[PDB]
Write a protein that binds this DNA or RNA. Sequence first.
DNA 1: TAACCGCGTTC
DNA 2: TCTTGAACGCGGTTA
Length: 1114
Amino acid sequence: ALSAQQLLNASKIDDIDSMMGFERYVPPQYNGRFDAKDIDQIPGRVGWLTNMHATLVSQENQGISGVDFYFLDEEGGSFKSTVVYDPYFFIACNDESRVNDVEELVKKYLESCLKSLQIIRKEDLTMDNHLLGLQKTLIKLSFVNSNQLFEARKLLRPILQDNANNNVQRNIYNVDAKHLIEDIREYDVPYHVRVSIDKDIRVGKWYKVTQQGFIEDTRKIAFADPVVMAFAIATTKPPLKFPDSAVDQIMMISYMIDGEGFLITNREIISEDIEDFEYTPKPEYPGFFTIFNENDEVALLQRFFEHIRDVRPTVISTFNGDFFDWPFIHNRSKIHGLDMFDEIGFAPDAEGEYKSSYCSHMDCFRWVKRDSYLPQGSQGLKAVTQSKLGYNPIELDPELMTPYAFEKPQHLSEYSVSDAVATYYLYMKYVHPFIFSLCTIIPLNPDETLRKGTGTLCEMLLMVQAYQHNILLPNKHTDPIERFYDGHLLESETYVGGHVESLEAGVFRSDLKNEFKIDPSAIDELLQELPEALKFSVEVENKSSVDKVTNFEEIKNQITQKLLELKENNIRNELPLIYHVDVASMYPNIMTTNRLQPDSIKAERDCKTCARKLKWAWRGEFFPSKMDEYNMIKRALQNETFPNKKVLTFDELSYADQVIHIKKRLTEYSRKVYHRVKVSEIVEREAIVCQRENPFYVDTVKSFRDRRYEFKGLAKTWKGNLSKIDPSDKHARDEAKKMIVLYDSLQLAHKVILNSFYGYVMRKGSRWYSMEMAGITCLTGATIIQMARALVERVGRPLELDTDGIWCILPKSFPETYFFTLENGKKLYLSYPCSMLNYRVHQKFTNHQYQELKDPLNYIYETHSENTIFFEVDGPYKAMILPSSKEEGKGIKKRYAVFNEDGSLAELKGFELKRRGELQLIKNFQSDIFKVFLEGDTLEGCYSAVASVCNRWLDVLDSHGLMLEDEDLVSLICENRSMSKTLKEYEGQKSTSITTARRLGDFLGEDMVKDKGLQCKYIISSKPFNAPVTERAIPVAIFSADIPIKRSFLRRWTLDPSLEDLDIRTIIDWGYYRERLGSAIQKIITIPAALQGVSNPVPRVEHPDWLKRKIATK
DNA sequence: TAACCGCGTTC
DNA sequence: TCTTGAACGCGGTTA
Ligand SMILES: Nc1ncnc2c1ncn2[C@H]1C[C@H](O)[C@@H](COP(=O)(O)OP(=O)(O)OP(=O)(O)O)O1
Ligand code: SF4
Ligand SMILES: [Mg+2]
């Protein structure tokens, strides 16, 4: 069957890898001991593992499944070895009495696929008394191949759906072996992952291939060096349109190999014989490119395909090559009669992405999207290169590439080549070390470590831990389709997340005095807690003792001066310090403090201080209908013929689509009757957390957090090295910076995976699901951060607060940073505002019930006090600009701008210029104003220097843009906007992006709006009027097209049949665009100035009504 | 006015 | 088949 067509395919693959140099090496036979202390005398071959692929092999009739491992040896060659391992899953029963009887049933019903049967015990944390050593008995169903495992799984799931569904009734006045199968387990594990876990094999490690298995060579830890190749293509699309594979040609293909770069050209579209040249933006990224000037598109592709075979790459890297680059090559190779699989070994898979067997295809766009921590507006290759590579790649309009093929091709080749050097060094500096080091710990291959969701990565890490501790894997979670509460059907239940608040707004600077009204009782507490808060810092936060200090009383008196000095002067006016307090890896440390894991959340029925009762906050959004109502609409629905995708009944439907209809018909009934559709209620629930459960989950979080803490630490050490270096030595400074951009990206690359251990608990299909633990983690974080704000509020003023961070000001007379001294010829760091917080969270949040198993054989536990929740401080900063809302008594959260002592921009957040695709004028306005919030010498002087830039930008919108040129206009007025889906999935929804897409469709043709993610760049129109903005967006692209279609389309949407004008200035509603500018100046300039006591610096933007009335009263 | 949506941020 | 979470700003429609 498919074993036959699956064993044919391997032949093909087996021959491809041999063509690309991957011999199938079988180790010599060895009748000796499986020694580990010396692997040198055991005969075999050493290799650095570089890929894995599940395959189907034959002896030495149906296939026996296994994994092909691709190696790079130390002699400079390569080989390939295979392991065989029986796929398997388990069966669980109700009655341990009858365990041997159902095994008899399994052997006979699964006769055609079962290979072996076994009775296995595993620890199951679902089970009473499992912490005393009790285990659960399972039946292990091994198989030959994975095609037979699937057959058996399709033979039992019928039984599983009888043992629950019904129960036939016969003799009403009155046990089968089939009803003992409670469930199957570990049935949905992918085969290649099952092998790497059970055999403890990872890509990026060194193994000595031997007859009895792979032996990890603990000696060599450093990676080997593959042969890397990155490439980017250039095409010849039509003007105004994205390239199509059918017609469009292929001008060039640039690529790089192991540090030497190459370029091949198509002379039927080009026009010159480009000569060998150099392009290195920085001396660290060489780019000497030798060009292969070829004639036709076939000579192109045939030289590319032959060069790959001549270099044997183990990794091909691209940039959005799975959605464009590769897929075009295949369609233009088929168009010219070639087989990519037969020539290179690449082909698309079930997900549409391109892969091979010997060569991992690394699409850099997936590391940038997932691990770069860059905003979506910075995920193009240019923004990525400036951010991560430290130079500017050459930009070129897409609508000038194919003309400049004939026009000026020696610059076109520089674009071609710049995209390659960007892609090659981006991969070599960021993608290669991150992904391959991630394969060291995560049991997948490079092209899957690169593409899986971060939640799935966490699932993989937790499975290795569950397997090595002999823990039975829970099945994948399935959400209940119907859930109720007090008689109402619910729309969405959730917990309340973190705590966000904006408190003050405006400008604050390290040289402009501020007013601090201080609570004396607050300092009185700081007075009492002071002796123990310093004993805190030296012990908990530095791992030392006050016995070794030389100056504890010397500094304790030193800082009690500055606090008692303030005890008298409650009201002061001094320069402020701008500081930031944020706890390091909050939610992970909240979890590892409270021993929080999903299996630790028990009930009353799952059970002297082991149970730790913690509180979370449930939030439900339910309909305002009762079940009498709910019952009434189901009867109406039952008398309706529904389509089949000829017409079926309501009960013949799928239950999932039943609720869908019910919800859509309860959608409108509940509204017209019960006045609304969503009613919100939040109840604070309590849950217990066993402090003695198998800590396999929380130990995976602690292990991964510790793995990130080192990178986050090394970055700080190199930050100080950059401080203590002369402001000139080029190499030095550069080197530092280079290292601090790598170690910040790396620690941030671990940041999302680390925090995905908390999100995994709520993920759809999670094996370890529990709404309780995610809610407990958030409310603990909320209560911690609100306790911290209540303290700083009484001694300074916090400006903004989010989840675990607090921006604040404190008077300059407040104690800042001191350093303890030891008799070791060393010193210890202390910043009092951090420690005063950390002492008091270590007094109201430590876990005095943390129990750990300290002798397993006798099942003894021991209690201690664990808490790893520390604040960290960054600063002091020079300035911070916080906007304010256009409504009364309301700031705005999640956006501000801070500035380093240097004047450099430290952090800018939330605003429109960072966001992907807003309107460029607002983006250009914002990238102009925050900089001149640093000029001037008084506050009201600041707001007027910034007002100059505000009025100059208003002059552009007030003068109808007649100062900007007819080409520098269209970009400053553009509004580029992405559409997550395709048009027909938006029917019923009317936005500006919607109509721009439909208008761009019947102009350029339906080929423009085929795939999703399309960029709706448009302008708002003046005509028609007395109408919505929704029905007024004009696709900006028409203005470069042909005049009659210009007038035809524009006249249709303007409702004016006369072609009065064709200029952008004619149709654009300037009153709209100046109102969107007026809102920006209100939020960032004037309203902030008012609340700081400065009259309107830009009186051309008018204060809102409520603030005028508030000004008149004062 | 206020609820509610899509998008893309900040956590 | 594959799949981290919630809170929020802002423009825009809808009730
Ligand atoms: N992608 C995310 N997914 C889930 N939770 C997140 C995410 N980002 C931030 N958070 C949640 C969990 C965080 O611990 C918590 C605080 O975020 P944040 O302070 O920015 O980083 P962090 O506290 O986890 O590490 P650190 O502060 O050292 O950079 O909010
Ligand atoms: S809290 Fe105590 S009684 Fe309850 S399950 Fe855990 S160990 Fe058993
Ligand atoms: Mg934090």
